[PDB]
Design a protein around this ligand. Sequence first.
Ligand SMILES: Nc1ncnc2c1ncn2[C@@H]1O[C@H](CSCC[C@H](N)C(=O)O)[C@@H](O)[C@H]1O
Ligand SMILES: Nc1ncnc2c1ncn2[C@@H]1O[C@H](CSCC[C@H](N)C(=O)O)[C@@H](O)[C@H]1O
Lengths: 610, 610, 110, 110
Amino acid sequence: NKLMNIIELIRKDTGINNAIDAVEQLALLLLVRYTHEVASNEISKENHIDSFKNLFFDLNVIDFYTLRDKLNHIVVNCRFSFSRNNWEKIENILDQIPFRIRSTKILDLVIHRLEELDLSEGIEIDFDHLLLNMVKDSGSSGAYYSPRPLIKAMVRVLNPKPLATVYDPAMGTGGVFVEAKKHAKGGLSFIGNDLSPFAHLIGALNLLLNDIDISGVSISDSLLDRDCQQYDFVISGVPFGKVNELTKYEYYYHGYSGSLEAMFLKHTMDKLAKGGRAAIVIPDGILFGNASHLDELKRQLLTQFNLHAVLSLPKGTLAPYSGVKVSVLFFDNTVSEKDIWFYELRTNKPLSKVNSITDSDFEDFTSLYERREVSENSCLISKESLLQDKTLNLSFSLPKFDKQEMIASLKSEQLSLVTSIENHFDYMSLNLECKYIHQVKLKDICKLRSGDKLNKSEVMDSGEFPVYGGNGVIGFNVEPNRHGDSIVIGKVGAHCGNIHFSTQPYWLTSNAMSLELLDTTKVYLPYLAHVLKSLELNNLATGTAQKFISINKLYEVEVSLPSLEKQREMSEWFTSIEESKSKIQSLLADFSRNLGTISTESITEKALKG
Amino acid sequence: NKLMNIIELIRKDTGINNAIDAVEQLALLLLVRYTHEVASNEISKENHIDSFKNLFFDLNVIDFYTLRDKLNHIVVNCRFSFSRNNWEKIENILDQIPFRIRSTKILDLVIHRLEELDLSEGIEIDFDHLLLNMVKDSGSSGAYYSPRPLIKAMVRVLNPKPLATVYDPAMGTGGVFVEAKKHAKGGLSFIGNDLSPFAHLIGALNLLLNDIDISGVSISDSLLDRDCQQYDFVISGVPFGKVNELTKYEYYYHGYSGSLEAMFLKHTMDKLAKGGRAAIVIPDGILFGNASHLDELKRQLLTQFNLHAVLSLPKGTLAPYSGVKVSVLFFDNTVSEKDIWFYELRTNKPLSKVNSITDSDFEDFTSLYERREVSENSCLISKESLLQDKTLNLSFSLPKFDKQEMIASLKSEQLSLVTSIENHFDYMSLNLECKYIHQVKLKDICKLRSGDKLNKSEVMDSGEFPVYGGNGVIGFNVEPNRHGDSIVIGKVGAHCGNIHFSTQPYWLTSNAMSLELLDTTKVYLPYLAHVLKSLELNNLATGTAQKFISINKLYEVEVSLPSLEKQREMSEWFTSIEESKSKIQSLLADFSRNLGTISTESITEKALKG
Amino acid sequence: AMSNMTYNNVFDHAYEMLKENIRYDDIRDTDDLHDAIHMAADNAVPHYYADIFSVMASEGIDLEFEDSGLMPDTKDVIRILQARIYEQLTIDLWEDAEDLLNEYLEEVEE
Amino acid sequence: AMSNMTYNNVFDHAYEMLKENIRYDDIRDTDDLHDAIHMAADNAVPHYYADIFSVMASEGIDLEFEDSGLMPDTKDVIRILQARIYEQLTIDLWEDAEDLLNEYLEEVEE
Ligand SMILES: Nc1ncnc2c1ncn2[C@@H]1O[C@H](CSCC[C@H](N)C(=O)O)[C@@H](O)[C@H]1O
Ligand SMILES: Nc1ncnc2c1ncn2[C@@H]1O[C@H](CSCC[C@H](N)C(=O)O)[C@@H](O)[C@H]1O
């Protein structure tokens, strides 16, 4: 609020990069004032040893160079028993971050605005309002900044023990340490690092304003290990991959394509101590299955560290800086023997541009973090299941119907309904002429002998060898009774007289009788099978409680047959019309019940809302 | 044979009617010679009293008039102890039948041919050959002549007892008496009558040649009774009806339209003695049912006389004279308490023109005359059955199927198959929008109370009052339980939860529960019936051996309903699509099995000859 | 033989359960007996093939249903018979149940 | 109770008919026994509802068919059971019949 007027005061001389140069200059002046205003009460007090105040900026006109020398002089008098011991860190930022204001009129107004600020519980909550108002106005400023509601929820589910050392590979603005201190308000050995000098200035300044030690904060390359050691907690919002100048610079990180979110994932795994929990925000593009070079990373991560929870964050949570979809892993080292919890966050409206993510949307995730089974927006997935798949994909989804497409497919069934019956109609009207050469009897043409009764020794579901009973094919015994591939007829069943033709050897049950022709020069077995089927042999049977056909009564059956040339022509006509009858009636039965379910469920569609 | 040469001799002087005038002249000369040749051996012998021979025709030139006087003179000498006592009959024929030959050359040749004929077992079988050859050549000559094979079969089935008096109302050529004498060869008091003089000449001459007494033969009108008496046997082949001059002549025969075959039927009934059998050949045109004036005749004939047999004779048995279909009745007087036997005669080819009826075709009818049950061509019919009908029809017939017309009607079923399902398809796609005003519960909208159990006191097939059970409508008790015309639901059955809507009062069984709405301002019962049907109430039921719905569990069922204006609009849409579902599936089931029987019986058509 | 269980053995098992069900659950409403008699009948029905036939062979039951709609419309005779014995139990309990409930309430009369 | 008829009562009725059928009709051909055992089995099957269940409740039979094709494919349990007892009679007679015919012919051996 007050800091926004300072940004508006910084105007013409830079006058090109109002977005970040103004924030960079403010943080440069604000940090210089912090050291000066802290040094005033540290050893100066009043009159015992007096210190010139706010005279370095306008020393001699403007001389920002002379300010650096007088600032050192103030600290020299202070060193007579943070900030002061590691003064090299604060002195280095002055080297890296240069002053750019060259107007006395403009500089005169900002420095007088600076002394008005009260650093006792005031500048803190006006600096984050400035930081938040900067990334929405500049977009690119969101590279070093992550949503505070995200950080607040991440550090809450972490629950850092007082005896812990929180570490951030990319400390950025230091928002994680601010939330970690706020979470444990009612200390932690904070460690940080960063590459861009502006974020190092913003991060170090913001940690000082919240009265957090900046002894662990530094400026270096996190991907380049040099020599480092693990830490108890590792929480970060890692960036996105690029190799503009770093194409050949990260040689020892072999396998990676220069992906920051992937290389930092390897960094956080190396820098996570035994028993230490972690939470890293990563984009969804690097947890997919097609990431071949990253499949090794996910494989070792899922094998060693206990990745037990992933949160789906809507696209794009990460501000106007990027619209990508992100997610936060929760691998806590230790043992990986636990299934992965999954929460899917949903908001009232798409975010990023305006009305961004809030801490109210994370309320459900915080409460249900350790309760695995939660309804609607969360679930549990198995570890070994996705590890056993071809590619390791970490983009999880929730595991949790009458339409007008049914009539569309039901119309297709009607298309096939008439397709075959019209073909069946006109194929029945051929009336191929034929004359019978013989008029023989079943007595003197074939051999009718029934088989014996099997004691249900074998009745396999499948087999290369069949068995025929009173009706149909039941059983698959390995021993044949009738080696001939002939015709069998039911005898003792209620469906006796059924004509079944066998193309292969089989065994004959006592409930049926085998027909084997005496002379192959007279009859074609399939023609005889149809003409025996046409005679309706069930009338021949007699009995009260059961129907039975006698072997003698079958011998006395007369059958008229034509020539072999015609028998095969008629059998092929007889068999084709029969197959169409069985198929068309079968499709009619399927079509009959399918129209019933389509008509009922369509009625229930408009009578029930659910 | 010999007589044909005489016919060929009679030539020029008549020379216009070779058909019958030649036969008339021959029979006139043949009869004159018969009396002369019979009188020669009767009293003349030789020399004791001598008689001039064959001198009357050429007495003085030709004088046929003088022949009549000399013929009388011969008989005068004979009368010194048939033909001679009743000489008036033979003398009358000379008056009625005139001589027409006027050529001496022609008359000289025929009379010398006449004396060559030997009357001892010779002229008989040459006269019928002449008679038979006349009707085939003249056609109209068949009016006085009937087929000899017909007469031979008729008289055989009559079996006249020796103590009998055979009578013919139309003696014609006398063929019945000739066959009656031949049938009883290994006497009968024959009586006859006729109107046409030519047939009286032919009939009297032919009876004399077969040595049959002509004392009962006369010339008169049979329809005019004058005064007559019954006879033991009445067999005739009656003629066909006409009233050219007889329009007003047969006044006392009231009711008839002048039908000879009908009036003679009345004559034969009046002239049949008690216990006397008869057989009359009549055309089929007068035994039909539309013969209104003849229905009285058939009614009294079937009521009094024992008409027990009718023979179907093919059209047209009665020669080239007429192609009409004829039949012979067999009414034997006595008592009419016997069913009517019927024989249907069939020949190898149509007759009449050439290859006419034979006595071989009657062989089956003669043997099976008294055996009622005979296969193929004969049957037995009931008397009271046709007497009870509206019109009495005596044209009996024999009381004794897969085609390509089935597919023609099966194609019509397919026409109706698509007719309704396409209408059912597009009527299901309406999607009429609706919004539910209320979302109530079954607890606070209706009253659910089940009925008591009835002890199966009444379960009538039909009735004005119904009873509802666990599923469907079973029973028709006269006492109502629930006067309201509301909704009932099954409770205890395996088909429980079935929704049946009642439009009228009924009694409620213990297997179901009644739903009656509390406020009629909220729900339309048919809409609730469909929405209760849509909820599938069978899931609500619990049980092991049987499924049961609790009354409390039905109260807890939630149902969303719209406005009354919409409920009726939706119920009418819901009910119509439901009716089409039941009807289309029902026609599918009929069409499914009908195609199966059409396909099978068409297969058996070409595999079996019978 | 095989099973000594009869219908009247099954009925007494179902009748005494109704004596227990009526007294413990009050069920003063006569329409609560329907849910009550069903629990005694459903639990008394046997499920073994020897018990079903032995009950079916004993006196007190037929294969004839009083209600045709209660027929399961299936080809399994076991299901048809256990639905059959149940159907008789409900109508046999019915006549005795109403009286059983009538004389049960000795608390509002003397 | 009701009916004292059991399966082994029915079987002895069918077995002794086969002893009578075999001896009177010679039937030396083993395929004539099929027509012979059927006549003894078909005639021994009961037709009353009390006799069928009492036989079904006794020992020696189940509701399980050896051949599924012999099932009548109907909803009447009476027809299914009388076809069931018949099916057992044919296979129970079968093992004893061949031996019965083997030792019957004492006229061609000693
Ligand atoms: N090689 C490198 N080493 C360390 N940090 C790097 C880097 N490359 C980029 N980064 C940093 O990644 C950070 C963006 S993330 C900023 C989020 C910050 N941790 C917070 O709490 O808000 C920036 O600081 C960027 O400079
Ligand atoms: N009023 C009438 N009275 C008697 N006979 C008549 C008649 N009108 C016609 N007819 C006769 O009916 C006869 C034809 S039927 C001749 C069949 C003859 N009975 C036979 O045995 O062959 C003719 O004689 C004809 O003259």
